[PDB]
Amino acid sequence: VSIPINNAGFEDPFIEVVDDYTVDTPPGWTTYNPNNLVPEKRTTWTSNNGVGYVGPGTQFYNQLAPEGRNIGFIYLAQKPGSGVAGFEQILDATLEPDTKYTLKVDVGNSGGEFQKISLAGFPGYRVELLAGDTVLAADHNNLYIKDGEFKTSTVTFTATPDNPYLDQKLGIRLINLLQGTFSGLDFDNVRLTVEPA
């Protein structure tokens, strides 16, 4: 049983040309920006985020997008250690007790080169499940993902009747840790499902 998420596979907007991309916050999401690394007005080369089309002929991946045409990316131009940024979405569903939540997202390490800049290397990722502003459970960079590949991160959480955050809105964050270069990474196919526990 799914909890609906807006633009969960970053398929909005449609992108016609393979490897073309946007540099603005994907519809349905907000830019998680606790260290002000990402500017309000972006270019190709500022710190930015957006969606990109991974299809046949892609120069960056050894497979198609995990879901549909598009993935969501986050690029950070500041040096490693400067902070983090990413995607955030607050949901209408609220944290309920005796319920087990399962968050899954695919995490992508883009390979290849862009404007003769090597994409080799990875910044590290964090996937967060939130109630309000509280990170209930999170995968802080537990998966090793090679250049050009995707892997699925899974975060689960069970709320007890005594949890302090019951009735707050559930949220998701997909974070670029900026702990290495090349300092971009991708996400796709966000899924949140729920079951009695």
Contact 109, 148 (CB under 8 A): yes
Binds a second copy by CB under 8 A, chosen from 27, 28, 34, 80: 80
Burial class (CB in 10 A: 0-12, 13-18, 19+), 195: exposed
Q: According to the binding rule CB under 8 A, does residue 192 interact with a second copy?
A: no
Amino acid (one-letter) located at 34: P
What would the x/- binding string for a second copy be over residues 81 to 100, using CB under 8 A?
A: x------------------x
Q: According to the binding rule CB under 8 A, does residue 168 interact with a second copy?
A: no
82: left (phi over 0), alpha (psi -120 to 50) or beta: alpha
* Spatial separation of the C-alpha atoms in residues 120 and 159, rounded to whole Å: 39
Amino acid (one-letter) located at 182: F
Q: According to the binding rule CB under 5 A, does residue 109 interact with Ca ion?
A: yes
Binding partner of 56, given Ca ion, a second copy, none, CB within 5-8 angstroms per partner class: none
Q: Would you call 27 helix, strand, or coil by DSSP?
A: coil
Beta bridge partners of 71: 52
Give the CA distances from residue 23 to residues 1, 46, 68, 72, 114, in Å, rounded to whole numbers and listed in that order.
33, 9, 19, 10, 15
Q: According to the binding rule CB under 8 A, does residue 139 interact with a second copy?
A: yes
Q: According to the binding rule CB under 5 A, does residue 106 interact with Ca ion?
A: yes
**In whole angstroms, what separates CA 89 from the centre of its chain?**
10
In the bound complex, what is the minimum distance in angstroms from residue 17's beta carbon to a second copy? 30
Q: According to the binding rule CB under 5 A, does residue 130 interact with Ca ion?
A: no
Q: According to the binding rule CB under 8 A, does residue 114 interact with a second copy?
A: no
Number of residue whose CB is nearest Ca ion: 9
Binds a second copy by CB under 8 A, chosen from 120, 149, 168, 191: 120
In the bound complex, what is the minimum distance in angstroms from residue 114's beta carbon to Ca ion? 10
What would the x/- binding string for Ca ion be over residues 2 to 41, using CB under 5 A?
A: -------x--------------------------------
**In whole angstroms, what separates CA 102 from the centre of its chain?**
16
Site for a second copy in 29-68 (CB under 8 A): none
